[PDB]
C-alpha cells in the first residue's frame, strides 16, 4: 500500500542488523560499526541523566532512545531520491509529538494532582496579575506540544522539495542555449550542497527531538 | 599459583569474546545489568574512568 | 586570599620535569610565622 | 542479543500509552471524515 | 625594552611580539599597543625579540603597557623549559589533593597551573 | 504525491503506532541491557 | 527532473566514501584500540599478582 | 479570482515572519561560542539551555509557517 | 463579497508579522543568561528563573499575534 | 461597504506588526538585568523595582498595538 | 466610502511608528541597570537621567499614537 | 484570472525577503568564532563544532523560506 | 498576460531587497577579523580561511534572493 | 502597455532599496579598522589588502540591486 507503510517496516529491518550482524561474537572490544552505536548510548545516557537525573532517566532511557533512532533513521530513508515518506508522511511525526506532550501533561496531573497547575504558576509576582501569570505558562507548556512536531516536519519536507525543484531547474538549464551547457554542471554542485545539508540537520533534529522533549518532562516531573 | 598462571593463559581474549561466556562463568554480569536497568541508570561507575562518556558538549 | 598570594601559590605550584634551584625552592616553600599583636597583648606567632 | 532483563514500561510509560490510544482512536474517526474530503 | 623582572632573579628591562596570557584571553603585542594595565595569569609565554624567541613559563604576575610604551612585566618566576611531563604528573596529584586540603583559590590555581603545564 | 497522499492516514498510523511501541519494548528489554552487559563485562574484567 | 537529482545522490556517496568513511574508519579504529587496551591490561594485572 | 489571488498573497505576507527566528537562532548560538570562550568550561550547562534558546526561537517563526501553508491553501 | 473575503485571509497573513519580534525577543534573554553566567560562573541560581520569566513574557507576545492572526484567518 | 468591510480585516492584520517592537523591547531591559546582576552578584534588590519600571512602559508599547487591533475587527 | 476605508486602514499603519519607541523605552533602561550595576551609587544621580530618556523615546511613539486618533477621525 | 497567476508570482516575490535575516545570522556566528579565537585561541577545536552549528540552524529558517517562494514560484 | 508579466518587472524589484541583508553579513565577519587580528597580532594565518567561508555562506544567502529574481524575469 | 510601462518604473524602485544594506556594511568594516588601529597601529599595512576585499565583497550585493534597476531602466 502507502509508501508510509512500507518504509516503517524498512526501519524495523534496518534496526535489528545494527544490534546482531554488525556485532561479532559479542565484542568486549567493539565493531567498527559497533562504535556509533557506543558513543550514542553514552551521549543519551549524560543527557536524560542531565535532564531528570531520576532513579528513572534509565526507565526513560528506551523512550528518549526509541525517539532518538526513530527520527535519527527516517532522516536518513527519506533522503533516497525515490524515497519520500516517513517524516515527509507528516501525519505521523506531528502526531508523535502531540501524543508524548499529552503523556507528560497525564503524568504531571497524576503525579501533582489538580496542583499541576502550580508548574505553571512561575513564581510570586504582582497581586492583581497572578491569576493571569497561570494562564500564559500553561499556554507555553502547550507550546512545547507542537513546536516539537512541526519543526521535524517542516525541515524534512522542506529539503526534498527544494532539491527537486532545482533539480528540474538543472534540466532546464542543460536543455537551453548552448552557453548554459557548459555550465550545466555548476547548478549539479548547488544540489549536491543541499543533498549533504539535508542530510545533516535531519541528523541533528533526531538529536534535538531527544533533547527537547528530555525538557519538557523535566518541567512536568520538577514543578515549576 | 603455578596452575593459576595457566588457567588465564587459556582463557585471555582480546578480540572478542561472548559476553555470554562470561555470563556462563559469572552470571553477576547479568545480577548487575537487571538491577542498573531498574534503578535507572545505566551509568556504572568506572565505566566513565576508563572507557569514558563518549562525547563532545 | 590576596591577589598576590593567588600568585605565591602559583609560583609555589611551579615547583610541582623538576628543575628548580634553590632559590626557587625558598620562593616556594620556608616557615615562618605571623606574630599578631593587639591595641597589647600578642596573638602568637602561627604559621605565616 | 535477545535475552531479556524486565523493563517496567506498563507503568511507568502508562501515561504515554494512555495518549497514544486517545489519538488512534480518534484518527479513527479523522480517517473516515478525511476519506469524505 | 620589555621589563620581565622577577625577585630572585630579573631577567630583562618594547621588543617585537610578545605572547601573554592575561584577564583579556589571550594577548599578542606588535609595536605599539594602548597603555594597558592586565593581571598576568599563570602563563606560557613567547617573547619574540626579533624573530627569536625565549619562552618563559609565567607565574602570573601583571603586564602594563605604560603610556611612555614600556611593556612592564613583573612575575615571579618567567624559562618555559624550565617548568617542564613529571611535573605535570607530581601538578596532577597535588591538584587533587589540594581540593580537600583560601583552599578554593589554591585549588583552582593547582588546576590552572597543571592545564598551563600540560601546555608545555 | 499518491503515496503521500492517500486518506489511509488511519492504515499509515497504525502501522506507524505499532513500529514505535515495538521497538521500545524491544530496546527496553533486549538490546539497551545487552550494550550495559559490554559495559559491565569490560568493567568486571577491568576489576580483575 | 529526478534523473538529476539521482546524479547528485551518486556523487553524495561518493565524497562520503572519500572523506567521511576514512574518517570514520580511524574514528572506529581509534576506539576499538582503546578498548583492547584497557582489557588485557587487567587480565595482565592479576597475573602479576599471581606471580606476587 | 480576486479570492484565488488573496490566499496567495496572504501566504506570501505570513512566510517573513520565519525571519525573526533565524537571527534569534543566531544570537543564542554566538552567545554559546562567546561564553565558552570566556570561561573556557562554561559549555556543560550552557550548551542545553542552547538548543533550548534554538527551539524556542524557531518555534515563534515555525507558527508563522504553519499560517503560511494555511494560507496557501486556504 | 470577494474583497471582503480576499481581506479575512490578507488581513491573517498581515497579522503574522507580529512573531518575528518574539523569535529575536527570547534569543536576547537566553544570550543574555549565557553571557551572564559564562562570565560569573555561579550567578546562573538567581539568574536561571529570572531569565525564564523574561522567555514567558517574549514569546506571549508571539503568541497574542498567533491568536490574531487565527481569528482573520478562520473568521 | 465590502471596501470598508474588508479595510478593518486588513487593518486588524496591519495593527498585530505593532507588537513585535515591544518583544524585542522587554528582552532588551531583561538583557541588562541579566548582565548587571551578573557582574554584581547582587544589584537586583536596587535595580530589580527600576527592572520593573522600565519594563511597564517598553511592553505598554506593544498593548497599545494590540487594543487597536481589537478595535478594528471587532468593532 | 472610500475616504473612511482611507482612514481604516490608516489606523492600522500608526501601530507600526509606535515600535521603534518600544524598543527605545527599554533602551534607556536597560542603560540605567547597566550603570547601576557597574557604578552602585550613581543610581540618585543617574535614576532622573534614565527616566528622561525614557519618557522621552516614549513622546516620539505618542506622536505616532495622536495621529492615529487624527486619522481615525479624518 | 490573470489577477490570480498575477498574485501567484507576487506572492513568491514577497516570501524571498525572509532570506536575507538568515544571511546575517550566519555572519553573526562567523564574527563571534572570531572574536572568541582571538580570546583563546585553544577553544578552537571544541568551538569549530558550535560555529558551524550556529550557521545552519540559523540558515534553516530562510531556506524553509525560500521553500515556500519556489511553492509560489515555481508552483 | 499583461499583468503577470508587469508581475513580473515588478517582483523582480521586490526579491532584489533580500541583498541588503548579505551586504550588512559580509561586512560583521571582516569587522570581526579585523578586531581579533588587532588583539593577537598574529592569529590571522589560522583565520583567515574561516573568513572567507563565513563570507561565502553569507553571501549564498544573498545570491538565492538574486536566483528568485531571475528565476522571476527569464524563468 | 500602461500596465507594462508602470511595471518598469515601479520595480526599477523597488530594486533600488537592496544597497541601503551595503552602504551600512562598508561602514561596518571601516568602524574595524579605526578601532583595530588604534589597538595596534602596526596593523595597519596587513590589514588594509583585508579591508579592501570586505569593502568590495559587501559592495557587490547593492551594485547587483543597482543592476536589476538599470537592465529595467537601461537595457
Known amino acids: 500500500l502507502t509508501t508510509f507503510s512500507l518504509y516503517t517496516i524498512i526501519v524495523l529491518l534496518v534496526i535489528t542488523s545494527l544490534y546482531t550482524l554488525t556485532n561479532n ?9 559497533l562504535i556509533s552505536q557506543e558513543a550514542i548510548y553514552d551521549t543519551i545516557m549524560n543527557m536524560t541523566k542531565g535532564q531528570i537525573g531520576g532513579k528513572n532517566w534509565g526507565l526513560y532511557f528506551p523512550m528518549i532512545f526509541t525517539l532518538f533512532m526513530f527520527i535519527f533513521i527516517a532522516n536518513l530513508i527519506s533522503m533516497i531520491p525515490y524515497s519520500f515518506a516517513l517524516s515527509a508522511h507528516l501525519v505521523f511525526i506531528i502526531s508523535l509529538s502531540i501524543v508524548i506532550w499529552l503523556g507528560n501533561t497525564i503524568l504531571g496531573l497524576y503525579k501533582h494532582g489538580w496542583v499541576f497547575f502550580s508548574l505553571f504558576v512561575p513564581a510570586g509576582t504582582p497581586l492583581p496579575l497572578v491569576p493571569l501569570l497561570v494562564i500564559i505558562e500553561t499556554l507555553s507548556y502547550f507550546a512545547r506540544a507542537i513546536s516539537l512536531g512541526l519543526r521535524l516536519g517542516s525541515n524534512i519536507l522542506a529539503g526534498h522539495l527544494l532539491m527537486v525543484i532545482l533539480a528540474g531547474l538543472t534540466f532546464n538549464f542543460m536543455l537551453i542555449n548552448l ?7 555548476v547548478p549539479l554542485a548547488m544540489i549536491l550542497a543541499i543533498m549533504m545539508l539535508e542530510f545533516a540537520i535531519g541528523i541533528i533534529q533526531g538529536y534535538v527531538w531527544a533533547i527537547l522533549t528530555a525538557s519538557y518532562l523535566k518541567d512536568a516531573v520538577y514543578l515549576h | 599459583l603455578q596452575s593459576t598462571l595457566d ?3 587459556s582463557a585471555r581474549p582480546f578480540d572478542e569474546l561472548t559476553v555470554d561466556d562470561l555470563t ?8 548487575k545489568v537487571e538491577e542498573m536497568v531498574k534503578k535507572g541508570k545505566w551509568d556504572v561507575p568506572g565505566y566513565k574512568d576508563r572507557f569514558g562518556n563518549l562525547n563532545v558538549m | 586570599i590576596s591577589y598576590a598570594a593567588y600568585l ?4 609555589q605550584a611551579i615547583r610541582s620535569t623538576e628543575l628548580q634551584t634553590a632559590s626557587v625552592l625558598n620562593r616556594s616553600q620556608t616557615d615562618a610565622f605571623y606574630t599578631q599583636y593587639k591595641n597589647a597583648s600578642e596573638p602568637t606567632p602561627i604559621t605565616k | 542479543m535477545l535475552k531479556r532483563f524486565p523493563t517496567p514500561i506498563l507503568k511507568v510509560y502508562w501515561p504515554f500509552f494512555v495518549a497514544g490510544a486517545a489519538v488512534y482512536y480518534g484518527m479513527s474517526k479523522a480517517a473516515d471524515l478525511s476519506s469524505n474530503t | 625594552k620589555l621589563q620581565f623582572a622577577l625577585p630572585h632573579e630579573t631577567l630583562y628591562s618594547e621588543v617585537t611580539q610578545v605572547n601573554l596570557p592575561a584577564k583579556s584571553g589571550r594577548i599578542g603585542v606588535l609595536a605599539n599597543h594602548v597603555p594597558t594595565v592586565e593581571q598576568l595569569l599563570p602563563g606560557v609565554v613567547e617573547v619574540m625579540e626579533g624573530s627569536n624567541s625565549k619562552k618563559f613559563f609565567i607565574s602570573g604576575g ?10 612592564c612585566v613583573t612575575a615571579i618566576e618567567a624559562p618555559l623549559e624550565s617548568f617542564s611531563e613529571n611535573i605535570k604528573n607530581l601538578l596532577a596529584e597535588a591538584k587533587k589533593n589540594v581540593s580537600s586540603s583560601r583552599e578554593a583559590a589554591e585549588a583552582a590555581i593547582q588546576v590552572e597551573v597543571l592545564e598551563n603545564l600540560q601546555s608545555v | 504525491m499518491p503515496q503521500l497522499v492517500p486518506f489511509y492516514f488511519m492504515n499509515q498510523l497504525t502501522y506507524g503506532f505499532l513500529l514505535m511501541i515495538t521497538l ?3 530496546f527496553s528489554q533486549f538490546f539497551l541491557p545487552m550494550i550495559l552487559r559490554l559495559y559491565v563485562s569490560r568493567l568486571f574484567i577491568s576489576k580483575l | 527532473d529526478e534523473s538529476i537529482l539521482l546524479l547528485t545522490f551518486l556523487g553524495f556517496t561518493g565524497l562520503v566514501a572519500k572523506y567521511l568513511a576514512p574518517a570514520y574508519k580511524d574514528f572506529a579504529d581509534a576506539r576499538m584500540k582503546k578498548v583492547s587496551d584497557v582489557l588485557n591490561a587487567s587480565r595482565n594485572k592479576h597475573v602479576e ?4 | 479570482q480576486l479570492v484565488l489571488a488573496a490566499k496567495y498573497i496572504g501566504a506570501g505576507i505570513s512566510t517573513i515572519g520565519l525571519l525573526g527566528a533565524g537571527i534569534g537562532i543566531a544570537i543564542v548560538f554566538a552567545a554559546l561560542i562567546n561564553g565558552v570562550s570566556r570561561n573556557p568550561s562554561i559549555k556543560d550547562t550552557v550548551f542545553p539551555m542552547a538548543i533550548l534558546g534554538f527551539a524556542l526561537s524557531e518555534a515563534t517563526g515555525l507558527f508563522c509557517l504553519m499560517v503560511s501553508f494555511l494560507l496557501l491553501f486556504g
Request: cysteine-free; overall charge positive; charged content about 20%.
Open chain 1, 179 to 185: 552557453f548554459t551547457l557548459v555550465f550545466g554542471f
Open chain 2, 7 to 9: 588457567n588465564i593463559q
Open chain 2, 24 to 31: 556462563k562463568i559469572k552470571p553477576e554480569i547479568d545480577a
Open chain 1, 25 to 33: 561474537n559479542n565484542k568486549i572490544i567493539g565493531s567498527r560499526w
Open chain 7, 49 to 52: 599478582a599471581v606471580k606476587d
Open chain 3, 8 to 11: 605565591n601559590v602559583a609560583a
Open chain 6, 24 to 26: 521500545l519494548i524491544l
Open chain 5, 62 to 71: 601583571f603586564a602594563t603597557v605604560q603610556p611612555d610604551s614600556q611593556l
